[PDB]
Amino acid sequence: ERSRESILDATERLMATKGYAATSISDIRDACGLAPSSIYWHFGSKEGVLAAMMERGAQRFFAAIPTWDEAHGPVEQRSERQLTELVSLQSQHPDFLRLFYLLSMERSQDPAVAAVVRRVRNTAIARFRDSITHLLPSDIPPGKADLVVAELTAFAVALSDGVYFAGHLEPDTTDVERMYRRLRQALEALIPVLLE
Amino acid sequence: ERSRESILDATERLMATKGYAATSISDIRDACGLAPSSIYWHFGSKEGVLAAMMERGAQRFFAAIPTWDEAHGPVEQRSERQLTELVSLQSQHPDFLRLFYLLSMERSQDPAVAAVVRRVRNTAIARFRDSITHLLPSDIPPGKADLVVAELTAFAVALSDGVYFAGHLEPDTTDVERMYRRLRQALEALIPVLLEET
Ligand code: NA
Ligand code: NA
Ligand code: NA
């Protein structure tokens, strides 16, 4: 819908400017022109707006990174982009990232929000899993591979989570590209260890 | 002195139940018997209390792990309980940890809170750095060591941050001990890599 996008657009700018608490459903109307009843009719509530806002922020973050089959090149890589995008995709668009980590720790969470948080986290995990499976030798038995891949994935996701906070808490001295370089180097080193 | 402790104790329990939002200065009095005016006089405000409580939780988290110099004797070398002490304390807090990440991302928060967050983060970084220096060969030129230790530390702290969220978002399938073992193994692998790159 054209109207759904209007609301989210307004909600982004308003919360960026005023923060969550001080952003009214009324304010959102003032910005997007849509009446509160129309807003409620779409997202059901303020939290329902926040969720949908946060989700499509994810959908764009992930689309800006190609999957492994979205490639291209003779397995250049198939790092290239995947790290390069991930690197550039932390440049003051954590945005959605900060919101994610905030919402992940929220207590007594609205169902719509908890569902969005879960889908985003699962997606991120799935995406790392897609890349990492290609770091293993092909002659590894699939069941054994599943265990190794799952453990490397959990490791990478953890490190990537840490990268946001490093950039947030130590923005001056943090090198995002360098850190993800150490990650892939760490993963390549851990593969022989895991198969032992 | 004893008054500060009973205020924080009451504030913990009240904030374990109830939400931060729904915990009033009034409620805190009801629990600890100290008047609101006495509470303010100590911590200055509600978020002023929140800070002090979160810091105290960190100081206890950090004391529960030894520094390299105070650790044992030299066998482990000194790490594998500094490991399990780190593993001991997840266990999935707060205590402090969830509050820390929440407060670290809070906007326009409060001078006293931002200071606590900064001290806790810096301490944790300092603690990892203290351990990691002994992973390097003795003959590395100090200035070059400083660069390598710093990069390994940033890496370790990042991984440790992610370990919390793994345990939070995937509590069923997350092995905390196994993860910190992979961190140690990763750090040992990265040391030669870092030294040949200066
Ligand atoms: Na209108
Ligand atoms: Na309308
Ligand atoms: Na040595």
Describe the model:
The structure is a homodimer. With 196 residues, chain A is mainly alpha-helical. Chain A has one domain: Tetracycline Repressor, domain 2, CATH 1.10.357.10. Chain A has nine helices and no strands. In chain A, helix 1 (2-18) crosses helix 2, helix 1 crosses helix 4 and helix 8 (142-169) packs antiparallel against helix 9. The relative contact order of chain A is 0.09. Chain A binds chain B through residues 19, 98, 101-102, 104-105, 107-108, 121, 151, 154-155, 157-163, 165-166, 168-170, 173-174, 178-179, 182, 185-186, 189-190, 193, and chain B through 19, 98, 101-102, 104-105, 107-108, 121, 151, 154-155, 157-163, 165-166, 168-170, 174, 178-179, 182, 185-186, 189-190, 193. The structure holds sodium ion (3 copies). One sodium ion (NA) is lined by residues 34-35, 38 of chain A. It is classed as transcription. The entry lists the keywords Transcription regulator, transcription. It forms a dimeric assembly.
Set down the secondary structure blueprint:
2 copies of one chain form a homodimer.
Chain A: H1 2-18, H2 25-32, H3 36-43, H4 46-63, H5 80-88, H6 96-104, H7 111-132, H8 142-169, H9 176-195
The complex binds sodium ion (3 copies).
InterPro entries (chain A): BetI_C, Homeodomain-like_sf, HTH-type_TetR-like_transc_reg, HTH_TetR, Tet_transcr_reg_TetR-rel_C_sf
Protein name (chain A): HTH-type transcriptional regulator AcrR
Keywords (chain A): DNA-binding, Repressor, Transcription, Transcription regulation
